[PDB]
Amino acid sequence: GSFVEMVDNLRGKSGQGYYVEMTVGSPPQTLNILVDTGSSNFAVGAAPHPFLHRYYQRQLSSTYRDLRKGVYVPYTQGKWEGELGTDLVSIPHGPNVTVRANIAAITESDKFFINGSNWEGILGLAYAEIARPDDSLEPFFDSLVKQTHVPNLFSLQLCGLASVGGSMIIGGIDHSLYTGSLWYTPIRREWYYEVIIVRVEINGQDLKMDCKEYNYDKSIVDSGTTNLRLPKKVFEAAVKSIKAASSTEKFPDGFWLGEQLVCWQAGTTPWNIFPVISLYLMGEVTNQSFRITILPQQYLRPVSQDDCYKFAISQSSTGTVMGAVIMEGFYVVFDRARKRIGFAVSACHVHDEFRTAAVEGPFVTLDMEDCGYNIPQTDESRSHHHHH
Ligand SMILES: CC(=O)N[C@@H](Cc1cc(F)cc(F)c1)[C@H](O)CNC1(c2cccc(-n3cccn3)c2)CCCCC1
Numbered sequence: 038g039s040f041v042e043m044v045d046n047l048r049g050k051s052g053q054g055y056y057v058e059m060t061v062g063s064p065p066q067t068l069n070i071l072v073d074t075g076s077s078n079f080a081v082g083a084a085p086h087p088f089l090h091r092y093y094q095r096q097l098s099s100t101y102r103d104l105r106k107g108v109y110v111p112y113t114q115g116k117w118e119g120e121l122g123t124d125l126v127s128i129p130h131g132p133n134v135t136v137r138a139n140i141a142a143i144t145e146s147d148k149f150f151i152n153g154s155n156w157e158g159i160l161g162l163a164y165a166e167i168a169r170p171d172d173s174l175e176p177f178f179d180s181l182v183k184q185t186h187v188p189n190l191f192s193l194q195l196c197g198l199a200s201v202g203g204s205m206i207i208g209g210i211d212h213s214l215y216t217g218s219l220w221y222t223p224i225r226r227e228w229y230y231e232v233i234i235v236r237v238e239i240n241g242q243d244l245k246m247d248c249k250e251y252n253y254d255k256s257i258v259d260s261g262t263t264n265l266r267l268p269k270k271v272f273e274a275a276v277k278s279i280k281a282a283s284s285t286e287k288f289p290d291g292f293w294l295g296e297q298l299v300c301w302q303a304g305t306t307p308w309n310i311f312p313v314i315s316l317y318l319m320g321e322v323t324n325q326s327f328r329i330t331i332l333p334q335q336y337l338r339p340v341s342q343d344d345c346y347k348f349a350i351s352q353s354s355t356g357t358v359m360g361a362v363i364m365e366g367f368y369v370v371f372d373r374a375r376k377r378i379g380f381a382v383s384a385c386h387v388h389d390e391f392r393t394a395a396v397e398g399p400f401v402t403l404d405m406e407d408c409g410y411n412i413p414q415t416d417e418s419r420s421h422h423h424h425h
């Protein structure tokens with residue numbers, strides 16, 4: 038488990054999430070597992086399903102122990118039901134350590150598994166706070182760090198229907214995965230990997246919104262979501278501005294809805310008419326920020342003699358979700374030990390002829406804590422005690 042043994046340990050199909058090979062149980066059962074920075078539960082298929090041809094067989098594992106507890110987890114469209122337990126977990130193209138972790142054995146599901154995905158489970162790498170059924174269910178990464186000598190840090194280089202590749206570096210930073218300098222934004226609160234966006238530009242033009250609209254009701258880094266998602270108001274401003282630059286082409290509304298492809302003749306796509314998008318993230322120094330710059334090659338997704346494209350930016354009512362669309366630009370450091378997220382330009386350069394994906398700063402201004410929104414506290418959340 039040198040960083041070199043972890044290089045290129047990810048695979049997937051385009052728009053269907055990235056997965057790492059894990060083993061579960063004794064003897065080890067090999068399974069492919071979606072890497073989700075947007076959730077906190079480790080769960081694996083554990084009974085027959087249409088789209089699966091292997092699953093976790095609890096009864097074949099000598100190290101399995103029943104927790105006698107059910108759990109239910111909805112996501113944006115998919116959901117599953119599970120029965121909790123613990124077993125030995127390893128990442129074979131990862132560090133050379135085995136840990137006892139919590140596993141949700143999935144017994145029923147709806148629209149969870151995706152035909153052709155090649156994944157049989159989901160690794161929630163976010164914090165205990167949002168774990169189901171409550172935060173006393175230690176997440177995998179927590180266990181791994183608690184039980185071994187692995188630094189409290191991981192890094193994602195997501196690259197590339199068509200196949201994708203990439204790397205999850207568990208426990209450090211591999212400099213062969215990036216070029217230029219690494220910029221860190223703070224983790225605002227440890228639940229999701231919540232960050233603050235202080236400014237947005239499309240083709241250098243500021244959208245000029247109250248900076249709180251950008252993080253309404255939050256902003257996060259989610260390897261589990263394909264698209265860049267944007268709060269309704271920001272989405273509308275953004276589309277207006279993208280439509281205006283690309284206006285030599287007149288697409289049907291369904292395209293802007295992300296529900297329809299548009300096509301040019303093989304190798305003739307007019308990239309230049311689509312604008313770069315810059316997201317300015319709060320720096321570690323007060324009044325400083327730095328931008329990540331997104332190419333239309335990242336947000337226009339490839340799907341006769343024709344190159345065809347899906348619009349990978351969609352509306353949100355649950356804040357700004359920086360999905361795979363965004364991450365594919367970058368080597369992203371989830372530096373849990375220092376409560377920061379780093380970005381650098383990826384050594385998998387998914388690059389334009391005149392423009393490039395960029396991580397740039399500092400930019401200096403005023404009043405970024407002012408850009409956070411505070412979610413309305415519900416009675417249900419206020420009432421649960423936390424003797425942890
Ligand atoms: C598209 C999708 O849904 N992706 C799953 C991962 C995923 C990928 C996939 F390919 C199929 C799936 F069903 C789920 C990912 O977590 C979604 N993450 C958010 C989400 C949304 C709703 C519930 C939960 N959540 C549950 C527990 C803790 N948080 C998380 C995080 C907050 C903002 C919106 C997306």
Ligand SMILES: [Zn+2]
Pocket residue numbers: 058129130
């Ligand atoms: Zn392998």
Ligand SMILES: [Zn+2]
Pocket residue numbers: 118145
């Ligand atoms: Zn059921």
Ligand SMILES: [Zn+2]
Pocket residue numbers: 422423424
């Ligand atoms: Zn109490």
Ligand SMILES: [Zn+2]
Pocket residue numbers: 171172173422423424425
């Ligand atoms: Zn608690």
